[PDB]
Amino acid sequence: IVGGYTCGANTVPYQVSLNSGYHFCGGSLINSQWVVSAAHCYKSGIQVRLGEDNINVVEGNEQFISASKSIVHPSYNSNTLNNDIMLIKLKSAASLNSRVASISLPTSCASAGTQCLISGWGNTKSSGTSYPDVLKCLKAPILSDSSCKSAYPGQITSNMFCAGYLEGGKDSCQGDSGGPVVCSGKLQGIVSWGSGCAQKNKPGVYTKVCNYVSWIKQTIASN
Ligand SMILES: NC(=O)c1cccnc1
């Protein structure tokens, strides 16, 4: 996250870190045994880390649980990033409390104008690299589809939305991928892609979660 703020320990209780010996992507806990993240984050051998603030220090509220199954969306296209969403089932159910909690799926799509919270342990610089050890947060509005499409001609599908600032300076970035975009207490987006980070006229692009609720529910019910 570029241009954000330190969230505070366990203030974003649904945020997870995907670990393969190191943090590589974010995710969101949607129930005691399932996590949603971006398909481009797919890897074998994932350990899901819940209850994290500092990812390099054991602070006392962590739960580390191995994934038992990963399901990439059936129509994921790695070249266009269309349908950038995947589900991860945990080997065992997480213990749910004030600091480890699920986030609700939306029943309606959010509108441009709506303010959302984006979070992650990704790069904090637009030029150069600095990875934080503690969770960073950013409040950003959903942008109109027209401004989104104008910023990225020929690249925005019906399964994506833009959020952020056209002036720049504030955005998600590498390492935040797979993480949550939460608006009005619902999961509306997944950190997906963006041309550099926090660049003028190049806002972040997020997977539209409201288009996938039926898929998510059906998949969970049978796996
Ligand atoms: N610019 C961005 O928001 C972004 C997000 C994820 C990966 N790369 C860039």
Ligand SMILES: [Ca+2]
């Ligand atoms: Ca920790």
